Structures are given as C-alpha cells and as structure tokens.
Design a protein around this ligand. Structure first.
Ligand code: ALF
Ligand SMILES: [Mg+2]
Length: 1091
C-alpha cells in the first residue's frame, strides 16, 4: 500500500474526505430533533439545551485531537492515486502527529506526487512505492574523484528544483486573525465562553460582559506573545545576495535562493550582516572562516582546498578532510583566488571556487533551526498531574452540589431552575488558567534573563535550572581570562645556577627571538587587522615583532623575517612548526608543549626536567622553543627531526574578576561545583585552589613511570606523599584517602579505571579532572546524569560542545566586550540586540564575558518554580472558597446582585495585577524549591486553610440564620433583594479571598518581602480598608449605595472578630506547613567537610 520511510515517521494511512451527509454530526442527530419536535407538540427546555450542547461538542471534537479528526472526517484508503491527505504518525521523540496534504503536478510529461511534513520534503518514488526524503550525495561516502571532476549544472533542471527545493529558510508568520482563529477553538477558551454563557442564562449581564472582555484581552495578549517568538526565530535567516554560479559553461550571476547541490559558486569576503550561503566545500583556493555560530568560539580557523588529495583512491572522510568543509552561517574573513590554471575559467571577482553540498533546512545550522522551531517540546509535558489536581477539586464540587440539590428540593425550589445552580457551582470550582501557569512564568523569566544578554534557545530547560546538584566548569576561557601577561624567557642560561632565573627581553640570544617570531599563526588582513590566537598576539607584541601584509614579519629593529611554509597545529602531538628564512640563510622553528618537545631535540639541558615543573607548579603556563639550521616543500617528520633548545615561554593567565564571587556563591548555595579541563594537572590544581573548588591538600592519579603497563600512583603537588594504586586488584580505601585529600583525577587514570567496581565510588569524591579529551567530558556528564544528579556546564570553545549538549542545562560564554555591544547597539539604533547574533553551540548563550551568567540563570529558574507553586495554591483556594460561598447562598433563595459581583471581581483583579510582580534576592539560598503538584506541602496547606475558612463560614451562617429566620415556601424563585444573609456572605467572601492573597505570598528566602514592594502592599491595604469600612459601617452612604442592610450593633463585633481571627489562623497554619515541609533535602554530594 502506502508508507513513508524516514527517521521522523512511524506509520501512516491514506485518507479521503467524506461528503457532508455522512459525517457523524449531521445525519445521526436528525432522529433526535424529530423526536423532540414530536414530543413537544417547564421541564423540557433543559432537554433541548443538552441536545444542542452535545451537538456542538461533537461538532467541535475534531479540532481538539488528530486521531478523532481522521476518524470522523476522512475514510482510510489504500490507493495512492485517489487519496487527498495522509496522516503521519511521528516517532516518540520528534514533534507531534499531524495530517498533511498530498499535492500533484505534472512535469516533463510525468506527474510527481509529493507533500511536506515539518518543512522536510517528501516525494513519490514509484519503483519503491514509498514516500522518501531527498538524500544528498555527501551523506553517503563519496570518492573525491567525482567531487573534483564536477563542472556545474547544465541544461534544464526542473527535476532538481522539485527534488531539493529552493535554498532558503521558510518560516511564515501567520496573520493575527489566522492565528486567533486557531486559538479560539482550544478547549480552554471554549470552556470559558461556556461559563460566560451560563452566567448570562442566570441574568448576570454586567458581570458576564466584564468577564468576557477580560477573556478576549488575555487571549489577544497570548497571541501577541506567541507571534513575537516567531518574529524572533526569523532573524537567523540571512537576506539573499548575489554570487556568480557556473552553469552552461559560463558565469551567470544568480541569487542565493537559486542554489542546488553540486553547483559551482565563487565565494568572496563575506559582506556585513551576512554569512556563507549554504554548506559548501572548497574545490580550489583558500579562506579564513570565523566559525562563531556553530562552535561558539572567536579564533579564526584556516580552511584549505581539496585539489591536492589523490582522486581515485581516497574517500571523502570529513575527518582528516575537515579543513575543506565550509559550513552555512559562519563569516568568511578573507579568501584568496586559486593559484594555477584549471579546465574552468577564473571567476570575475576575487573569489575562490567551491562546490555546494547541502541547501535549505538540511544544512548544519538549518537542521538545528528546524528542530528548534517545529519539533520543540513544550513545558510540563505530562499534564496528568494538573488534570488529577483539577479532578480533586471537582470531587469537592460534587460533594457540595449534592447538598445544594437536597436542600433545594426540600425548600420547595423548582428543580428545572435548580439544575442550573448545580451546574454553576460545579463549573465554578474549576480554574481555567491553571495548566498554562508554568508557561507564563517561564516567559517572564526569559524576558528578565534576556535583559542580561543571556539569550535562550530551548525554553523548556528553565525549570531544570532551579534544582541543580553539580556545576562543571572549563578552565581556559571560562574561569581564566584571555588577556595574559608575559613574564619572560627562562632556561636559556646554559650554566643555570638558578632555576627560577628569567630573562625578560632584549637580552636573549638572537636565535630565541628569531624562533619566537617565525613560529606563529597570525595573518594581517588586506584592510589592516591582526586575526589569530590572542596568546600569540600578546607574546609577539611583548617581544617586539610586527606582522606585515605579505607573510614577512619584520621591522623589529633586528632584521627582516619572512615565513615560507608553515604546518598546522593539531591537538594530537600538540606542537606547531614553520619554516622561515633570514637575510643570511634558512632555518626552522617549532613551539609546542614542553613534554613532547623534550623527546624531540638531541641536546637536553641538565635541568630541563626541573625547570618547567618549577614554573608550572605555581600558576604559569610554559611552552618550549627549539630551532635548527636548515640548508636549501617536504614532509613534517624531517624538519622536526633534531633540534636545539632556545628557552621557554612563560605566561601568567589571570582569573576573571567575577570568578571567585560566583564560585563562592555556588559553594554556599548548596551546589557542588567541579572543574573539567584540558591542561596538565598541576596548573589545574593551582587554579582550582585559587578559585575555591578544592580546599585542603590534593592528590593526583597518574601513570607511575614511562611504562604503559596501566599502573597508577597517588602523587601530590609536592612529592612528599606517594601512595601506589593498581587498577586490577587494589580497591580505594575510604578513610585513608577520600576523608583527607580532596583528590583530582587525570584523563589517563580515568581511562584505565574503566570497568572498576569503585568507579562510581570515586566519581563522588573527586572535584578536579585534568588532561581529559573532548570525548571524555561526554562520558563524565553521562555518568553524572546516570547517578541521578542534574548537571550544568559552561564552556567556551569546541573542546566541550558534546558535553554542553549532553548536560541538563548548558551555557556557552561568548567572550565579548561591553563597549563592543555598546557600539553595535548605537550603530543599529542609528541605522536591542536580537537573538540572531547568538550562536547555536548550546541551549543558553551569554553574549558577555563575565561568569555571573550561571548565577543569573539559576536565580531565574528558581524564581519561576516558586512563582508557579504560589499561583497553584492561590488559584485552588480562591476557587474552593467561591464555590462554597455560592453553595451556602444558593441553598436558600437569595442570590448575589450584579454590581456586587462586578465590584468583587474588580477588587480581586486589582490584587491579581500586583501579585505577579516580584523581585529576587541577590544572594542565593540553601533552600531549593521542589517540583511537582502532589506533595505534602501544597496539599496540606490547601486542605488546612480551606478547613479554617469553612469553619468561619459555617459559624457566621449559623449566626445569620439565628438573627433572621427563613421558612420553606412553595414555588420559590431565586431573586435578589437586600437582606442580612446576602450582606454577611458577600463581605466574608470578599475578605477571605484577600486573606488568601496576603497569606500565600512567597516570602523572604526566594524573593523580596511583601512589605518591600509597594504596588502590592498598597493595593492589599486599600482593598482591606474598603472591606473593613463596609463591615464596620464607617460610611452609611457606602453601605446604602451598594444595598447593604443595616447590621445590628452586636453582629458587627462577631463579624469583624471572625474575619480578623480567620486571617491569623490561616497565617499560622501556612507558616507551620511551610517551615516543616517546604524545601527538599540537597543531594549527598553537596556537603562541605574535611579533616
Ligand atoms: F582549556 Al579547556 F576545555 F577550554 F581544557
Ligand atoms: Mg575552553
């Protein structure tokens, strides 16, 4: 039959529409209408009411669900030539199900049946008879022969236009009405308009009118808040610009929309506020890209061509062959034209030839944007907790409605008009805005965050950030600034009477300064700029070299130097070498970590082992410099064969100004903060000890000797204590090691301890991991998740992008300057800082440099959680109080007026306005809020406060019935007339709702006290003053204007004392339950102790 093969879909069945007669909501109902018309030709109007209600509900039901829609409207078919829709069942982790429309169109004499799901195309492959997404050639492993030989699209290419589609993000913003039409059918809005219809049937005109106005206003606000996000996602797509495209064996200038895979383009310097069109691959030339978006890093990489690789043999690896790929969405700082001639002519502009590989949403950035927009997960996915919470209130509602019905039957009330009061109560218990609470809280939190330049991409991670047990920090770029001072050269003294004897500058032998000048990766752009590693710039400026436009770097007052050919720098065998030439002869330079350089050169100074350990133990970060004279294009293992030492390079990387305070706050706020770095263990331990992650002594796990026999040693920064350990037999001693030393683990000892029984006993008591590879950070975060701890990681570069994506909440600190943002905002204003500039490296993205982003995110998540809790409690209590007051008043005849109900509504909306506003404390607290609706705190507090309120209500009702008696009459009508019961019940309801507002407000440990903020304090005092002036008859005209019967002087005392004691009882109960059951206990990892 018909299927769809794709990782998104799970199953699908074809559909075809049904005529209007056969639908379930037209034909089966005519017999019922006819039966009503026959039986009619009092008590029968309710029959017609419920009939029309069931009809409208069955008519609306297809819009709530999708399976119901496909079962009502469409009939499943198994012939692909007749269907006009298809129902797509999604996989459990990609978006939600949906119905999509099959389209047909003929091309070149053969029609092609297709549709489009989640902006991911499909087509109809006849020979397989299954809808299959387009598969690009670069996905499966190609031989680079066909990539080198490609010469652009020729002839008519409409089929490719249909298969791959245009190259542009397709994010449509719907008109306001076309979106309000989709919100007006949701179950919640339908229920609210149903309630308003009931209140109209009960002859409440002004009240229902005001309520309907409020409903419409809230829905329009929600639609605007939903449209602004779509308007924010659209800025990631660039604006099209013209690049020359090779088609039909000649250069014709096409725009960027009209690009297909395997199409030759010519890329140039990227324009302002633009990027690379699509995922290209260099075919000839050279470029220097700035992979800011995908990698969250600033240092410009250097991309190289593909022509040099052998054609028939090798395979396109995207491993070693990664210096040729150019992603989509990164800037290109400088591009150089091809050197030699080729079979194809040179482009007219100064650009380099490149081949397209992926277009549209299927590029690297495009796939992430699609998953971000369409297949995103909403907050509070379960929703069963909220539904059960609403059902509990409805149980209470039925418990009250039964008594209302029994007493209404007793007092001779008309049943036909009593069923409506039962329905009013049962529908008044239900609060409509309950499930959409966390979403509004999260939106407010996101705005308050974006005020700090901390832009977020996936917003369902905010409730995760409240209760965090472990925080992981990368060292270089996160806890340590980029700017680094230069202390001086060391170890050049051949005599070396002193170990810590440094040579500053202008005193080293000329060989050393030549080596420090020749071996660098800087380049001077044509316009005039220096782009490269900031460390090399600092070193090269401090020594006194200067880089020129051509590769020569000279004018240092000591000669002229030019760089002939250089070698790249790789993490494996980390070192960099380059070949240079001076006026006299030719030599070579090399600069890498001192360990690897040691095993390279022949002449080994007697104290080489001691010097770099003496300089690395205390803060500094050393590198080695070695050279060799070379007499007059060859391999790398020859230039690095034998070398001669020339000194060290000793840098002091200082901490960020905001690191110590952030780590101190996180340590005091019941969080455990650990370090995961890539530097050698001694520097990691020193920085961790200076910041405040380790306190006491520290032990290190490393290899014992040069033998790789997998035997570790517990060593110390000073070699005083050395405890041997063996992974095969020995097991960690708890009180001998972990209770004294706060140990730190290396990447090698972590790799050798795999499979141990005590790996998960060691991963609790260590706080510093050093020399870990980019793949082991993923393993560490996966294990810290598996143990049951929620995690956080904040890292800058590409060493830790996998870790950032694995952690529960990930932050990427994009190092920037405040004055740079000021200049950018000023230029934008003359022409805020939209999300478009933020990267796609992690969920969150701090646009500034300082580390306070972690604290800020934690604070906002915590406040969102606690605000949700208080809103749950307040809504439930107000609803229950209102329902039981309505029941007490409806048992007898009397009912509220119109103005009384409207005034109550306005006086409570006054408090609803203020209560949302709150300010968080600057310091975090040890008490973290727990997640969930069902727990002892919420249910206990709600139930007990409600017990107090019902006690008060029963007491005053007994008193009122004692003062004036009501007798059961025949054929009553619930009419409004000023009496004592109406007054008593109205004042009590209005006072007790305000009392719950004032009692269930969240206090000091999480936010600012109620007394502090005035917009709520003064509102509550105003409403209390009005209610108490009403209850005490301070103004007779005020009571007369609202039709309040004069109360006997003895009754005022009971009423006022009753309310004033109700408030105190409620306050005491809630304070008790809060002080006992509020905050959950922190984990077994975030405790502070050492002997
Ligand atoms: F210096 Al790193 F991960 F950025 F070890
Ligand atoms: Mg880093």
């Amino acid at each position: 039959k018909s299927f769809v093969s794709s990782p998104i879909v799970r199953d699908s069945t074809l559909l075809v529409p049904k005529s209007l007669i056969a639908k379930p909501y037209v034909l089966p109902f005519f017999p019922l209408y006819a039966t009503f018309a026959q039986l009619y030709f009092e008590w029968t109007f309710v029959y017609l009411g419920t009939l029309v209600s069931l009809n409208i509900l069955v008519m609306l039901m297809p819009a709530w669900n999708v399976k119901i829609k496909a079962k009502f409207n469409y009939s499943t078919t198994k012939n692909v030539n007749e269907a006009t829709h298809i129902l797509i069942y999604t996989t459990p982790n990609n978006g939600s199900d949906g119905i999509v429309e099959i389209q047909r169109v003929t091309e070149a004499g053969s029609l092609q049946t297709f549709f489009q799901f989640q902006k991911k195309r499909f087509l109809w492959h006849e020979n397989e008879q299954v809808f299959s997404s387009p598969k690009f050639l670069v996905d499966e492993s190609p031989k680079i022969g066909d990539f080198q030989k490609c010469k652009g699209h020729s002839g008519d290419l409409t089929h490719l236009k249909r298969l791959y589609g245009e190259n542009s993000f397709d994010i449509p913003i719907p008109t306001f009405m076309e979106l309000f039409k989709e919100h007006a059918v949701a179950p919640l809005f339908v229920f609210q308009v149903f309630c308003v219809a009931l209140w109209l049937l009960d002859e409440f005109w002004y009240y229902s009118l005001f309520n309907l106005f409020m409903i419409i206003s809230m829905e329009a606000a929600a639609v605007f808040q939903r449209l602004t996000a779509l308007k924010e996602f659209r800025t990631m797509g660039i604006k099209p610009y013209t690049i020359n495209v090779f088609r039909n064996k000649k250069w014709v200038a096409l725009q960027t929309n009209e690009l297909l895979p395997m199409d030759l383009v010519s890329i140039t310097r990227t324009a302002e506020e633009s990027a690379i069109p699509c995922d290209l691959i260099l075919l000839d030339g050279s470029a220097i890209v700035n992979e800011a978006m995908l990698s969250g890093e600033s240092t410009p990489l250097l991309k190289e061509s593909i022509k040099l690789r052998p054609s028939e043999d090798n395979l396109q690896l995207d491993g070693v062959d990664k210096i040729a790929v150019l992603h989509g969405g990164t800037k290109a700082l400088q591009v150089t034209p091809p050197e030699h001639k080729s079979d194809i002519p040179p482009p007219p502009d100064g650009g380099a030839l490149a081949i397209v590989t992926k277009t549209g949403f299927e590029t690297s950035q495009g796939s992430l944007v699609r998953v971000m927009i369409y297949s995103a997960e909403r907050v509070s996915v379960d929703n069963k907790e909220a539904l059960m919470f609403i059902l509990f209130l409805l149980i209470f509602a039925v418990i009250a409605s039964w008594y209302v019905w029994v007493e209404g039957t007793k007092m001779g009330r008309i049943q036909s008009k009593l069923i409506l009061d039962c329905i009013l109560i049962i529908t008044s218990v239900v609060p409509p805005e309950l499930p959409m609470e966390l979403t509004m809280a999260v939106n407010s939190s996101l705005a308050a965050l974006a005020k700090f330049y901390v832009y977020c991409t996936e917003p369902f991670r905010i409730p995760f950030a409240g209760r965090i047990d472990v925080c992981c920090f990368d060292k270089t770029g996160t806890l340590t600034g980029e700017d680094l001072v230069f202390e001086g050269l060391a170890g050049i003294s051949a005599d070396s009477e002193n170990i810590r004897h440094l040579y500053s500058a202008a005193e080293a032998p000329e060989s050393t300064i030549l080596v420090i000048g020749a071996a660098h990766a800087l380049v001077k752009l044509e316009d005039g700029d220096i782009v490269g590693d900031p460390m090399e710039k600092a070193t090269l400026k401090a020594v006194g070299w200067a880089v020129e436009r051509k590769n020569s770097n000279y004018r240092e007052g000591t000669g002229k130097l030019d760089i002939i050919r250089r070698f790249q720098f790789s993490s494996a065998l980390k070192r960099s070498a380059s070949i240079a030439s001076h006026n006299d002869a030719l030599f070579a330079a090399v600069k890498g970590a001192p360990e690897t350089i040691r095993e390279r050169l022949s002449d080994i100074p007697k104290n080489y082992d001691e010097i770099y350990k003496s300089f690395t133990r205390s803060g500094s970060r050393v590198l080695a410099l070695a050279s060799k004279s070379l007499p007059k294009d060859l391999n790398r293992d020859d230039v690095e064969s034998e070398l001669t030492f020339n000194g060290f390079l000793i840098f002091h990387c200082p901490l960020k100004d905001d690191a110590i305070e952030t780590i101190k706050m996180l340590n005091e706020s019941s969080h455990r903060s650990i370090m995961i770095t890539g530097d050698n263990p001694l520097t990691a331990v020193h920085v961790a000890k200076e910041v405040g992650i380790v306190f006491g002594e520290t032990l290190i796990l490393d290899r014992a000797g040069k033998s790789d026999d997998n035997q570790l040693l517990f060593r110390d920064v000073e070699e005083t204590v050395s405890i041997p350990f063996d992974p095969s037999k020995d097991t960690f001693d708890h009180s001998k090691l972990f209770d004294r030393y706060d140990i730190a683990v290396t990447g090698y000892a972590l790799n050798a301890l795999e499979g141990h029984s005590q790996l998960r006993d060691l991963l609790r008591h260590t706080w510093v991991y050093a020399r870990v590879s980019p793949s082991q950070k993923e393993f560490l975060l996966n294990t810290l998740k598996d143990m049951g701890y929620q995690t956080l990681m904040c890292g800058d570069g590409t060493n830790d992008v996998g870790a950032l994506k694995q952690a529960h909440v990930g932050i990427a600190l994009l190092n920037g300057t405040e004055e740079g943002l000021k200049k950018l905002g000023e230029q934008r204003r003359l022409e805020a800082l939209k999300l478009g500039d933020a990267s796609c490296a992690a969920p969150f993205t701090s646009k500034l440099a300082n580390v306070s982003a972690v604290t800020n995110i934690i604070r906002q998540g915590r406040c969102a959680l606690v605000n949700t809790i208080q809103m749950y409690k307040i809504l439930a209590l107000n609803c229950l109080i209102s329902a039981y007051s309505l029941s007490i008043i409806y048992m007898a005849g009397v009912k509220f007026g119109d103005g009384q109900a409207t005034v109550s509504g306005l006086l409570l909306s006054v408090c609803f306005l203020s209560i949302s506003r709150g300010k968080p404390l600057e310091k975090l607290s040890k008490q973290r809020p727990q997640s969930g609706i069902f727990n002892v705190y919420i249910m206990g507090s709600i139930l007990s406060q409600f017990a107090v309120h019902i006690a008060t209500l029963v007491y005053i009702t007994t008193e009122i019935y004692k003062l004036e008696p009501r007798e059961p009459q025949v054929d009553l009508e619930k009419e409004f007339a000023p009496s004592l019961l109406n007054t008593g019940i109205f004042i009590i309801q209005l006072v007790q709702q305000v009392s719950t507002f004032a009692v269930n407000y969240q206090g000091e440990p999480f936010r600012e006290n109620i007394r502090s903020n005035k917009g709520m304090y003064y509102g509550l005092l105003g409403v209390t003053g009005l209610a108490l002036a009403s209850a005490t008859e301070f103004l007779p005209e005020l009571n007369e204007a609202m039709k309040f019967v004069p109360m006997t002087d003895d009754f005022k005392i009971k009423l006022t004392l009753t309310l004033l004691l109700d408030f105190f009882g409620s306050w005491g109960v809630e304070h008790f339950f809060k002080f006992f059951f509020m905050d959950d206990k922190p984990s077994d990892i975030s405790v502070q102790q050492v002997k």
